[PDB]
Every structure is written in structure tokens, then in C-alpha cells.
Amino acid sequence: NVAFTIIFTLEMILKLLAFKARGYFGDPWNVFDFLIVIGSIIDVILSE
Amino acid sequence: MSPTEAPKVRVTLFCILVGIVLAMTAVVSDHWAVLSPHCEAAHFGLWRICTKRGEKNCSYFSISAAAISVFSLGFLIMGTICALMAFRKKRDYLLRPASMFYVFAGLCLFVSLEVMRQSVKRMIEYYYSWSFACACAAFVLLFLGGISLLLFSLPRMPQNPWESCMDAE
Numbered sequence: 001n002v003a004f005t006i007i008f009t010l011e012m013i014l015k016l017l018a019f020k021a022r023g024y025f026g027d028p029w030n031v032f033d034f035l036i037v038i039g040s041i042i043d044v045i046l047s048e
Numbered sequence: 049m050s051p052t053e054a055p056k057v058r059v060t061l062f063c064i065l066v067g068i069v070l071a072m073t074a075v076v077s078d079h080w081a082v083l084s085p086h087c088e089a090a091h092f093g094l095w096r097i098c099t100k101r102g103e104k105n106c107s108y109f110s111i112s113a114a115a116i117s118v119f120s121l122g123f124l125i126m127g128t129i130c131a132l133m134a135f136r137k138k139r140d141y142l143l144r145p146a147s148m149f150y151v152f153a154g155l156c157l158f159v160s161l162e163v164m165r166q167s168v169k170r171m172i173e174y175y176y177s178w179s180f181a182c183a184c185a186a187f188v189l190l191f192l193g194g195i196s197l198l199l200f201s202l203p204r205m206p207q208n209p210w211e212s213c214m215d216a217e
């Protein structure tokens with residue numbers, strides 16, 4: 001639960017670097033992918 | 049312009065700006081547990097916890113419910129920073145992630161509701177006339193407005209075989 005959550009975080013930091021933000025929130029799967037990464041982190045912190 | 053000048057996005061954003069304080073009501077109010085032994089009434093909150101007989105005495109002590117609402121304040125800062133700069137500098141995509149944190153603002157509030165219901169469930173009645181109906185309005189505000197703010201800046205279902213989400217302008 002922690003080990004995957006770090007990995008899909010690290011696909012999202014990379015997909016901010018390549019598109020520089022303006023282009024990342026243009027494709028609405030990435031908007032959903034931003035939504036999953038956040039709530040998955042709160043799954044970790046609130047559990048522990 | 050068209051995502052940020054529309055009347056549906058400015059009615060919505062001011063309705064975000066109302067319930068940002070309704071949680072801040074609940075963050076310093078201590079009213080949504082009314083104990084009644086019969087006197088030994090208590091008035092619980094998020095920081096203050098207040099036993100009244102008059103001899104009004106409020107104090108401290110359920111520490112899970114406090115730490116969650118830091119991120120119901122930490123997101124609530126970070127939700128506002130993007131939304132503020134999303135009017136200037138001709139950025140309008142940035143209106144989308146600011147809607148995200150407002151959803152995760154109220155979702156941290158709904159946690160701290162039920163945990164202070166579990167500070168009641170182990171602890172004679174339960175009654176509310178101020179805090180429960182404001183914080184379970186602030187949740188009901190922030191969760192519902194941010195989702196509406198989210199839908200109003202995603203483009204549309206394309207309706208026709210040439211359109212695409214993310215198409216020029």
C-alpha cells in the first residue's frame with residue numbers, strides 16, 4: 001500500500017516536468033490521475 | 049476567460065468562500081455534543097471541551113480528530129493559492145486542481161465529524177444545535193462545490209465525432 005503509492009506518485013512528478021503544468025491539466029485522464037495520487041497519500045497518512 | 053468569467057464559476061467560487069469560514073466556525077466552536085446526566089452537562093469540540101453545571105468551565109483532554117483537520121486547513125490554504133492566481137496570468141487550467149483540494153478539504157472534515165462522534169459513541173444523550181449542523185454543512189458545502197467547480201472547467205462530452213477534450217481554445 002505504501003510501495004505502489006510511491007510509484008504512481010513518481011509517475012506524476014515526471015508528468016509534471018515534461019508538460020510543465022499547463023499541459024498536464026489539459027488531458028482529463030491526468031486530472032483523474034491527480035485525484036487518485038492525492039487520496040492514495042491520505043490513505044497512507046491517516047492509516048499510520 | 050470563458051472558464052473564468054462565466055457566471056456559473058463565479059457564483060460557485062463565492063459559495064466556496066462562504067463555507068470556508070463555516071468550518072472555521074466549527075474549528076473554534078465546541079458545541080456538538082450535549083451531555084445530559086442531570087448538573088453535569090458537557091460541551092465538546094475540536095480543541096475546547098466544556099463542562100457546564102453559571103459555572104461555565106471549558107478545558108482540554110480523540111487526538112486523531114485534531115490532526116486530520118490540520119489537512120482540512122492545509123489543503124484549504126493550498127486550494128486557495130491556485131484559485132487566486134488562476135485569474136491573472138491567463139492560466140485557466142489551474143482552476144481545476146484548486147477544485148481538487150477543496151474536495152479533499154471537506155473530506156478531511158467528514159473524518160473529524162465521525163471521530164468526534166466516536167468521542168461520543170464511547171461516552172446521557174447526544175444533541176446539537178450549532179456545530180454538527182454547521183460542520184455537516186461545511187462538509188456538505190465544500191464537497192459539493194468543489195465537484196461542481198471541477199465539472200465547470202473540464203470541457204464537455206464531445207457530442208460529435210470531431211471534438212476532443214483538450215481541443216484548441
